[PDB]
Ligand binder design. Structure first.
Ligand SMILES: CC(=O)/N=c1\sc(S(N)(=O)=O)nn1C
Ligand SMILES: [Zn+2]
Length: 257
């Protein structure tokens, strides 16, 4: 099965998922000098005050925090989007070292980790239908850099012990994802794909320009997770990121000048 090790990592995915070599794959490098300011772009509208987190799960590739998405509780609108997108889960990608870990890069700069808030277009009725549509998902990407601790992340960091191996989950209620947002919502946007298999090209990416900072100690706790399941050989969950893919026929737009 696919993963991030040397025999089954990203450069192998195309043998099982040939869309890996598609025209609108993610992530990409954001060249800040060739991105186009588009004043047609609206501000983002993040409405997370009624969010209901349910659970945190180690799925063998990352950990996900899952939300109740059976109603318009936590939604994303505005920006380049049409319609209403519901939050279903968030997860991170991170590195073995502080100089790598993010999926997107900015003028080839890598960050220590990248947060993905995944949302699906309610007009398609459920997540599984949405991933079949070119406008079905909107993923908010936020970079993490190492510096001062992020207090709103510590609830997540503290439970990681209880989901160390693949397939473990824990109740994770009353977590407020607003505590993970930077001060500014300026962004870049481009049409792209999921960054793990099945690599479907159904995502409007919205990548925030301002990183959040987390402490060394917080990211170190990410690095103690396991890709393996309980009882199996320990393989630390690190470097679960996909490298930048060719931009091909796409334009990155910026909401700011
Ligand atoms: C969110 C979900 O159910 N799946 C995902 S989200 C995703 S990501 N990385 O955000 O692009 N990749 N995949 C396969
Ligand atoms: Zn992701």
């Amino acid at each position: 099965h696919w993963g991030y090790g040397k025999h089954n990592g990203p450069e192998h995915w195309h043998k099982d998922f040939p869309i890996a070599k598609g025209e609108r794959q993610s992530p990409v490098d954001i060249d800040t000098h060739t991105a186009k300011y588009d004043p047609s772009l609206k501000p983002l509208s993040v409405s997370y005050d009624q969010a209901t987190s349910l659970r945190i799960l180690n799925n063998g590739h990352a950990f996900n925090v899952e939300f109740d998405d059976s109603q318009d509780k936590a939604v994303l609108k505005g920006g380049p989007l049409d319609g209403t997108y519901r939050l279903i889960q968030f997860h991170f990608h991170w590195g073995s070292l502080d100089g790598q870990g993010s999926e997107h890069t900015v003028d080839k700069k890598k960050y220590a980790a990248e947060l993905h808030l995944v949302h699906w277009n309610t007009k398609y009725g459920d997540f599984g239908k949405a991933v079949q549509q070119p406008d079905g998902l909107a993923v908010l990407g936020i970079f993490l850099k190492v510096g001062s601790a992020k207090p709103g992340l510590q609830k997540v960091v503290d439970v990681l012990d209880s989901i160390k191996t693949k397939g473990k989950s824990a109740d994770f209620t009353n977590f407020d994802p607003r505590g993970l947002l930077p001060e500014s919502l300026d962004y870049w946007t481009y049409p792209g794909s999921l960054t793990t298999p099945p690599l479907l090209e159904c995502v409007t990416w919205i990548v925030l320009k301002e990183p959040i900072s987390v402490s060394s100690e917080q990211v170190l706790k990410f690095r103690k997770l396991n890709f393996n399941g309980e009882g199996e050989p320990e393989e630390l969950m690190v470097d679960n990121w996909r490298p930048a893919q060719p931009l091909k026929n796409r334009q990155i737009k910026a909401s700011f000048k």
